[PDB]
Ligand binder design. Sequence first.
Ligand SMILES: CNC(=O)c1c(F)cccc1Nc1nc(Nc2cc3c(ccn3C(=O)CN(C)C)cc2OC)nc2[nH]ccc12
Length: 285
Amino acid sequence: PSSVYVPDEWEVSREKITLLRELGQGSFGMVYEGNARDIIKGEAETRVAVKTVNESASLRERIEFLNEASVMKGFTCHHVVRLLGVVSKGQPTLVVMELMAHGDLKSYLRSLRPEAENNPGRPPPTLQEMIQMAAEIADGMAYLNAKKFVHRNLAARNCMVAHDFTVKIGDFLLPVRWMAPESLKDGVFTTSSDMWSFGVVLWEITSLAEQPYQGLSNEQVLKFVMDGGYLDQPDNCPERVTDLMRMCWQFNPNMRPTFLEIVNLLKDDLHPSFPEVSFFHSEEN
Ligand SMILES: CNC(=O)c1c(F)cccc1Nc1nc(Nc2cc3c(ccn3C(=O)CN(C)C)cc2OC)nc2[nH]ccc12
């Protein structure tokens, strides 16, 4: 493992980063809420998420932390959480990401339940909002597929929610309840198995983040899904999203839609800004 990171236009002066509070444990270590001065042209200050590697990390893990930041430089998708800057001079290394103020999608969904103690005084997602979420997630996944990344871990806990409620793909032992039968059987992960996970995300949206296969152990889920089992439809689930889930959960991975096919299905009734920001409508597609 050697440093591929070139201290370039992405390099941010450490003193430009002010840390406000802990947000929680990320993959590599603590994630902080921060404020960054003059990192984006036209903005004097930018709210940011700041990732760090935990103190127990090896030298290798620190190098791998910085190499991941280097990879993220190549991504410019509105529906994938974006890198803003890197502090690689001295320790600790800081990886500065766009802030997603409403946190992960699973927790956000669970907050909108009628019984929730942390309910923000708003109704649960409307059909329109759920379709919008689905399209945004699908577009972000379409982009990563075009970049030749198989996600392997798609779940509501791994999607993030912005200030304006835009949903984006976040960070990319086994999550068996989100896994396709062929992955459970042979450990084969493809964009087609990512599509299976996408259907589970739709199920999480329409159940306000219930635990998939509640009342079944992980061993029972493994067998159930490999045998051709899949999730039941949530109570009063909109027909349109039920239809998407059905496609996603075809046993033959060849018979599942692609992420571009999903966006295309949903494109005719989305927010006006969608074609201006999406990978789907971009010249890159
Ligand atoms: C892979 N996990 C993370 O990166 C992560 C985490 F594990 C915990 C907390 C934050 C993480 N990452 C990011 N968070 C945010 N915004 C954000 C998330 C928040 C909260 C409060 C609970 N949150 C959770 O998501 C807790 N949840 C994991 C249970 C506040 C936030 O901004 C005000 N923006 C981000 N941008 C890039 C990473 C990131």
